[PDB]
Design a protein around this ligand. Structure first.
Ligand SMILES: CC(=O)N[C@H]1[C@H](O[C@@H]2[C@H](O)[C@@H](O)[C@H](O[C@H]3[C@H](O)[C@@H](O)[C@H](O)O[C@@H]3CO)O[C@@H]2CO)O[C@H](CO)[C@H](O)[C@@H]1O[C@@H]1O[C@H](CO)[C@H](O)[C@H](O[C@]2(C(=O)O)C[C@H](O)[C@@H](NC(C)=O)[C@H]([C@H](O)[C@H](O)CO)O2)[C@H]1O
Lengths: 404, 404
């Protein structure tokens, strides 16, 4: 375990599942993601806060004891102009009237951790991810934050399992944190919201191996992710990003094939995300028990989004003596006796075209300028890297990311 | 073998070893590193140039043929004041009077690649490493740069084998590079020098695999590296950095043990490097090569520098029940029948204390606030990370990095 606080959703509210049974209360309007109620949004244009009343005996008051904090945060930039201001605002507050304890704050494209003792001596850690230069891994995406505190060593800041910033806290004396942890946007100039999920406190300094274990497990790997790090959904319009060609987008040709030799236009240095064809994912075998979540090894149809309500199947043209099979839009609504098997490697999604007789056509990818299904990828994967042409992200249009 | 230009040192000059017999001319005062002549230094306070007259065959003049550039660069910041100006200056120029071709340029903590066609259309790739926040892997260090160009897709900038920037060059037409590659610091507003080594042009778009191979193999993998990325040397004074404890330095206690609970002071956010004890390395038995280069599996003595005259052996105190053996300074010059076996994982150095009888005492490391030899590390290594207590860098005091 090591966890002395596990914030999780149960029975239309948030509860502590660590065993220390800390009390969690919602005040005002707190958004719950319908598809993952572990995820909550907080606003600053209303009353909107989560207050954890910590178990009296977990409340950190010490000079020597090690502790760690982990959570995921989602920071929308909207138009990217509203956020472009040098001002620091608190999102998670665990500091007493003494100003002893810790807090998580934000700035323009920045996450900040502050730890301060009873004497007003502090240490601050920062991650500055900056503006989207091509494709951003951070803006409007779930970001896994982990702060580990060694009282005889340094405080270390991790982002998505990677060590970013570490500074000595050997100078820090007795730290007494607030009885309350307040999830609220305080002193933000503009109106916005922030996403929080899987907030944890641990009674030790986590090592890299334990941090990477939390990073992969907490999201639930069995369910595929969209671009933003949310659960991939059936019956939902998505743009396509090829992870090996982040500057390219998919367009329809007149012969009903798909081109990938289209360059994304830039807003400053940021690639446009809402470019090229939109697709919807559909279950092969429907039911009532079935939710809208896309899981590993689910058999689906990839539907091209046409003029309006109209949806045409994507299929691999197998009538060729060349190994790569051209992807075509079926005008007739014929599936050509094919299914697509969904799978993933982290946030990268794969689409394996198979005939209904169970034979492999190949993974969705590209050959020169054309989108194809190819078996080449099975034996030519590049390990522990996003530079594989069979890796795709699904981008849903959202108010959090504006290209208006 | 896709190399069409390979700049290496032979017979008191630089020559093309690719076999395409391009000419390399040294004009004026160009510094050659005595320990690695393949590395050269370029000044802007006087005449300092390397000029490659490319063989007419290798001169790039095409709109479809893929190509890659690779080289290491070393950029000192001195006392981090004179370099703090927004001023883009050229270091490598392959631009025709047409302003067609490519060039490498620098700004404050920045490396820039520019590619331009005959019609003035250009694309720029940038790497901004910024100021030292604790420890910098970039400032006054050998940085491996790799640019690959797909005329049907992206130009890609790699730093130390990692993809940093990629942008479409698909809209670029005929590119005609100049006949000459000029290594010279041009339009830098301040006086400085720049290190270069292992310049290559390739006649294809290298993949991540080939870039990773050049990164590890170009500098001799059998020779250990100092903090800057130069070869580690015998009979040379070094400060110590523990890689797991970058904010800490090693001092001597009055009892002759070594403390690691000493915190580096900062200039802005940059840790001091010239703190704590000085060590020198000495061969147990002299080398047949006639070198001062520290190699993998070399048996050495590590000597504490009390003063320039007075050197004292480091030994592991084996007169204890503890598994970890406290490192001590031998006042009497007694080495207690021990040697140190040097090895490396990339730029990380390991020091294995052993008895002359062949028994292992343990890798140099720490247990809480005390430097130790410990066999624990043998069976408790974390793979694919610098987060190991038995990983060390050796910092030589140099004018390129000032802390004054
Ligand atoms: C946790 C620890 O002390 N590990 C020792 C190891 O201890 C053994 C068991 O693992 C202990 O549980 C047990 O505890 C008993 C006490 O000894 C006893 O007094 C008490 O009465 O009862 C306890 C419960 O029974 O003791 C046994 C003894 O065998 O013993 C080994 C030797 O075999 C090591 O000493 C080990 O400590 C590690 O020592 C190495 C050097 O040998 C090194 O100093 C380690 O320190 C680092 C590291 O390099 O990995 C330093 C890092 O900063 C630190 N943190 C991070 C984030 O990396 C890591 C830790 O691994 C991390 O804090 C937790 O994963 O340690 C040092 O840990």
């Amino acid at each position: 375990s090591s966890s002395v606080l596990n914030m999780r959703y149960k029975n239309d509210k948030y509860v502590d599942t660590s065993g220390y049974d800390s009390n969690i209360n919602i005040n005002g309007d707190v958004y719950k993601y319908p598809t993952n109620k572990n995820q909550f949004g907080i606003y600053n244009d209303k009353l909107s806060e989560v207050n954890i009343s910590q178990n009296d005996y977990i409340i950190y008051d010490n000079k020597y004891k090690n502790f760690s904090i982990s959570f995921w945060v989602r920071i929308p930039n909207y138009d990217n102009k509203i956020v472009n201001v040098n001002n620091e605002y608190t999102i998670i507050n665990c500091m007493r009237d003494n100003n002893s304890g810790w807090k998580v704050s934000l700035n323009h494209n920045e996450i900040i951790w502050t730890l301060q003792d009873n004497a007003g001596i502090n240490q601050k850690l920062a991650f500055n991810y900056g503006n989207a230069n091509g494709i951003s891994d951070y803006i409007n995406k779930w970001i896994f934050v982990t702060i580990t505190n060694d009282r005889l060593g340094d405080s270390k800041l991790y982002i998505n399992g990677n060590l970013i910033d570490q500074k000595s806290i050997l100078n820090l004396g007795n730290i007494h944190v607030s009885d309350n942890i307040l999830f609220k946007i305080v002193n933000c100039s503009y109106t916005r919201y922030i996403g929080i999920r899987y907030f944890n406190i641990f009674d030790k300094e986590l090592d890299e191996t334990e941090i990477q274990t939390l990073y992969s497990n907490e999201p639930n790997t069995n369910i595929l992710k969209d671009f933003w790090g949310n659960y991939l959904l059936y019956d939902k319009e998505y743009y396509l990003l090829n992870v090996l060609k982040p500057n390219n987008f998919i367009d329809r040709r007149k012969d009903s094939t798909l081109s990938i030799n289209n360059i994304r236009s830039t807003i400053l240095l940021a690639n446009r995300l809402y470019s090229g064809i939109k697709v919807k994912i559909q279950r092969v075998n429907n039911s009532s028990t079935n939710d809208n979540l896309v899981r590993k090894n689910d058999q689906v149809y990839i539907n091209f989004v046409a003029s309006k309500t109209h949806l045409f199947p994507l299929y691999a043209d197998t009538a060729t003596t060349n190994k790569e099979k051209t992807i075509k839009i079926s005008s007739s609504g014929n599936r050509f006796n094919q299914v697509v098997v969904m799978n993933s490697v982290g946030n990268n999604c794969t689409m394996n075209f198979k005939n209904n007789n169970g034979n492999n056509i190949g993974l969705l990818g590209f050959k020169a300028d054309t989108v194809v299904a190819s078996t080449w990828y099975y034996t030519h994967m590049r390990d522990h890297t996003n530079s594989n042409g069979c890796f795709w992200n699904f981008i849903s249009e959202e108010h959090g990311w504006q290209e208006k």
